[model samples]
Target: KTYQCQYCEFRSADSSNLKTHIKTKHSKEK
Candidate 1:
């Protein structure tokens, strides 16, 4: 459902969670 960003060394448990991560912490995608 989710994955760590290869672009930013970021991590998340699911797509929605990852979306939250991106929305809050970054402007990049993996």
Candidate 2:
């Protein structure tokens, strides 16, 4: 299974990476 970003098309095999990507990429939106 893979973790998918809710805000974008990014996907990751690890949940942690997905979380970091969301924070780093979408911090302004939050």
Candidate 3:
């Protein structure tokens, strides 16, 4: 799955990377 990140302004081809990025970046938000 591909993800477009608005917060970091990134377009990722690797789903796992996007997941990791969100996890690392937004874990506090959750």
Candidate 4:
């Protein structure tokens, strides 16, 4: 109900938590 991952639309209440999503859930590869 708060922050969301711009790359995957993953939702998170904290901005810090969202980055992890980007790193793993969103990161392209090496």
Give candidates' CA RMSD values in order: 5.0, 2.1, 2.9, 2.1
Q: Quote the RMSD, in angstroms, for model 1.
A: 5.0
lDDT, each prediction: 0.72, 0.87, 0.78, 0.78
In model 4, state the lDDT of residue 6. Answer: 75
TM-score against truth, every candidate: 0.44, 0.72, 0.52, 0.53
- The TM-score ranking, best first, is 2, 4, 3, 1
Tens digits of per-residue lDDT for model 4, 1-30: 688777766788988878877987768498
Residue 6 of candidate 3: its Cα lDDT? 62
| Top-scoring candidate (lDDT) | 2
lDDT of 3 by residue, 1-30 (tens): 667876778789988888788788866465
For model 2, the local distance difference test gives: 0.87
Candidate 4, residue 9: Cα displacement in angstroms equals: 2.3
C-alpha lDDT of residue 13 in model 4? 95
lDDT of 2 by residue, 1-30 (tens): 888999999988998888889899987554
Tell me the lDDT of model 4 at 16.
80
